[PDB]
Amino acid sequence: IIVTTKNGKVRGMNLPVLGGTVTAFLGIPYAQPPLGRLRFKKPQSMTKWPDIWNATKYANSCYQNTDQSFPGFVGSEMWNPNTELSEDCLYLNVWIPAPKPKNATVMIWIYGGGFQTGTSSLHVYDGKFLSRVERVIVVSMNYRVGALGFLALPGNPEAPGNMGLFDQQLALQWVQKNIAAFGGNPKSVTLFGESAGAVSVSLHLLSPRSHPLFARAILQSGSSNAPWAVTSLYEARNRTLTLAKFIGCSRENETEIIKCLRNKDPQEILQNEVFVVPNHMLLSVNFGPTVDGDFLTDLPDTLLQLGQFKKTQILVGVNKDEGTAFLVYGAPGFSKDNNSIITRKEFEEGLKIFFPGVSEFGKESILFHYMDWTDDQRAENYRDALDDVVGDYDIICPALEFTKKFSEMGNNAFFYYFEHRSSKLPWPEWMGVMHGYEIEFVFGLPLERRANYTKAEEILSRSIMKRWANFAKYGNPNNNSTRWPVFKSNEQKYLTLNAESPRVYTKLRAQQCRFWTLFFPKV
Numbered sequence: 001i002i003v004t005t006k007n008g009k010v011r012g013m014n015l016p017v018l019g020g021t022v023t024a025f026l027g028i029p030y031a032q033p034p035l036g037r038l039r040f041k042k043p044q045s046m047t048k049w050p051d052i053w054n055a056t057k058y059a060n061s062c063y064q065n066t067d068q069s070f071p072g073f074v075g076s077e078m079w080n081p082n083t084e085l086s087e088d089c090l091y092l093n094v095w096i097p098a099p100k101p102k103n104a105t106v107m108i109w110i111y112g113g114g115f116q117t118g119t120s121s122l123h124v125y126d127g128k129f130l131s132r133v134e135r136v137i138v139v140s141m142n143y144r145v146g147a148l149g150f151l152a153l154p155g156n157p158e159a160p161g162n163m164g165l166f167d168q169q170l171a172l173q174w175v176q177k178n179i180a181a182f183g184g185n186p187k188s189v190t191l192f193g194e195s196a197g198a199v200s201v202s203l204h205l206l207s208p209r210s211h212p213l214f215a216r217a218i219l220q221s222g223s224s225n226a227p228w229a230v231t232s233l234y235e236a237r238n239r240t241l242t243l244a245k246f247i248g249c250s251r252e253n254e255t256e257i258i259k260c261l262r263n264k265d266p267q268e269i270l271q272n273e274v275f276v277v278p279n280h281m282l283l284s285v286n287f288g289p290t291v292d293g294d295f296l297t298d299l300p301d302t303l304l305q306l307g308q309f310k311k312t313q314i315l316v317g318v319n320k321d322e323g324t325a326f327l328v329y330g331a332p333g334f335s336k337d338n339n340s341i342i343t344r345k346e347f348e349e350g351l352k353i354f355f356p357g358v359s360e361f362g363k364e365s366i367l368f369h370y371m372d373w374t375d376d377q378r379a380e381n382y383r384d385a386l387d388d389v390v391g392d393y394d395i396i397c398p399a400l401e402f403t404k405k406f407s408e409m410g411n412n413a414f415f416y417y418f419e420h421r422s423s424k425l426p427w428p429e430w431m432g433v434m435h436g437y438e439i440e441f442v443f444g445l446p447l448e449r450r451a452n453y454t455k456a457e458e459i460l461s462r463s464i465m466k467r468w469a470n471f472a473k474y475g476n477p478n479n480n481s482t483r484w485p486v487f488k489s490n491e492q493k494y495l496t497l498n499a500e501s502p503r504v505y506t507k508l509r510a511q512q513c514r515f516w517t518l519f520f521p522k523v
């Protein structure tokens with residue numbers, strides 16, 4: 001099962017997948033480990049090995065703080081790393097169908113986690129079913145997160161910033177130089193990711209040196225024009241100097257502030273990593289993408305206006321209840337153990353968490369347009385509205401504006417609206433169709449009948465996998481099934497995804513997105 005790469009031979013394995021076989025290569029090194037003097041630096045090219053590399057096991061996950069908000073709760077711990085943590089984490093995984101193809105489409109997955117957490121070895125990112133059913137090749141890599149991946153000093157090569165984004169770009173280059181040996185076409189590469197991974201995919205669309213590294217893009221619950229996606233260059237410097245203060249590496253020679261951090265323990269860096277931002281949450285990307293002038297030369301909104309992006313097809317979409325997962329981690333009155341009926345005082349305190357710098361009249365504008373504009377006097381009125389406030393502002397409306405921008409320029413786009421709640425979802429009912437729970441349907445986990453999903457969930461997962469692979473192969477997700485129309489700038493049609501009957505509507509959340517883009521900036 002041995003495949004020869006440009007750096008050496010790799011040894012894989014055969015997996016029983018749905019009455020067939022999928023060949024897996026887990027842990028192929030694609031970059032020199034960023035240890036010692038290489039910490040905070042851009043990734044270096046991988047060295048050559050003369051032997052056989054046993055890529056038969058998930059490699060290490062990058063250092064990251066783990067979620068401990070709900071101890072022993074499977075709904076939150078399923079996202080925590082499931083391999084040993086280590087700075088030596090730059091590895092990728094490949095899934096090849098059986099029998100071996102000759103020019104298969106390659107889909108490369110980029111995980112999320114607010115640019116502070118995440119690994120490619122999670123069970124919900126297992127790409128064996130996708131390669132088995134749709135006969136594509138699936139690739140996924142680990143990239144540095146947190147300060148170890150996004151510590152930024154402007155123009156300083158010791159810590160230039162966006163290093164985790166360069167980790168992804170180097171893994172993309174590995175697929176160009178090597179995927180033909182495994183049976184994949186380097187000209188049919190589609191990037192797909194969720195949340196911060198969707199921000200990463202949409203940042204490769206705005207980085208010219210990544211354009212020749214892929215063909216198409218899929219954005220799941222995220223886009224680089226979201227308010228939490230990118231910080232300014234001076235903002236990232238403020239946060240590096242803040243981390244140095246807490247950890248005790250504050251110097252007036254900047255280039256030697258990095259030599260001090262390079263001698264701190266990674267666990268020590270993670271502990272002071274949280275004090276950098278005024279309030280640590282999921283959307284408080286303390287060390288994430290910045291306008292570094294190298295990987296990213298301008299704010300994503302500016303680049304979209306100037307048409308400075310890869311002209312190609314994109315497949316974007318969001319989930320029905322995007323904000324609930326974020327409210328349970330910070331907003332007062334929200335709990336996973338009760339229905340979270342919040343009061344008006346708790347609503348206004350939730351706005352203060354997710355809108356830290358806006359005035360009291362600005363909060364009164366959000367409150368009027370989401371509550372007092374309608375007669376909704378139900379007991380869940382404030383709870384559901386705060387879900388829509390965070391969902392529209394941070395995920396849904398930015399993703400719709402990104403899709404609109406690709407459409408104005410004349411590129412074909414396809415927008416979805418995921419509406420299905422997993423029967424195995426461990427979170428309570430009030431959270432609904434949560435952020436991050438379309439991924440198991442994209443990766444075909446309900447196809448294992450021993451996983452005890454409903455029969456309709458296996459059908460829905462096969463439908464979503466089919467549309468995802470069709471878009472990667474032919475640039476169009478579409479036959480006698482319900483046709484998925486092209487998102488045009490004028491009509492703005494989208495397709496809902498659910499286990500009953502997919503439907504086509506127009507102008508998703510139009511009234512709310514018009515408030516965030518046309519009126520709220522003026523208050």
Ligand SMILES: *[C@@H]1O[C@H](CO[C@@H]2O[C@@H](C)[C@@H](O)[C@@H](O)[C@@H]2O)[C@@H](O[C@@H]2O[C@H](CO)[C@@H](O[C@@H]3O[C@H](CO)[C@@H](O)[C@H](O[C@H]4O[C@H](CO)[C@@H](O)[C@H](O)[C@@H]4O)[C@@H]3O)[C@H](O)[C@H]2NC(C)=O)[C@H](O)[C@H]1NC(C)=O
Nearest residue numbers: 328330331332333334335336337338339340341342343346
């Ligand atoms: C849904 O659940 C949330 C979360 O509550 C916590 O989890 C639940 C699963 C359950 O175990 C709860 O007991 C647990 O607290 C609820 O929101 C919390 O509500 C409590 C009160 O019910 C708040 O704590 C109080 O806050 C005040 C200011 O600090 C203060 O008055 C209280 O202290 C005083 O009272 C206690 C007696 O409770 C006494 O021991 C003290 O000495 C003092 O006198 C108390 O600390 C939490 O802050 C709330 N959490 C938030 C806002 O995040 C929520 O009410 C619940 N909703 C429904 C509809 O059931």
Ligand SMILES: *[C@@H]1O[C@H](CO[C@@H]2O[C@@H](C)[C@@H](O)[C@@H](O)[C@@H]2O)[C@@H](O)[C@H](O)[C@H]1NC(C)=O
Nearest residue numbers: 001011012013014051052053054055056057
């Ligand atoms: C690499 O693996 C060789 C063969 O191991 C067998 O096949 C692989 C695919 C796995 O299924 C494994 O569990 C099997 O035992 C070993 O002979 C060889 O020693 C390994 N190389 C190193 C460096 O450990």
Ligand SMILES: *[C@@H]1O[C@H](CO)[C@@H](O)[C@H](O)[C@H]1NC(C)=O
Nearest residue numbers: 102103180184185186187188
């Ligand atoms: C694979 O497809 C590309 C175009 O997409 C073509 O140039 C190439 O010759 C094909 N076959 C291979 C690499 O065997």
Ligand SMILES: *[C@@H]1O[C@H](CO)[C@@H](O)[C@H](O)[C@H]1NC(C)=O
Nearest residue numbers: 237238239240241242243245
């Ligand atoms: C970061 O910015 C704040 C905003 O005013 C400023 O007060 C603070 O001194 C800065 N921190 C630094 C430069 O470490």
Ligand SMILES: *[C@@H]1O[C@H](CO)[C@@H](O)[C@H](O)[C@H]1NC(C)=O
Nearest residue numbers: 424448449450451452453454
């Ligand atoms: C699934 O449901 C069946 C119902 O008979 C049960 O036997 C089984 O233990 C459940 N769980 C799994 C993981 O198969």
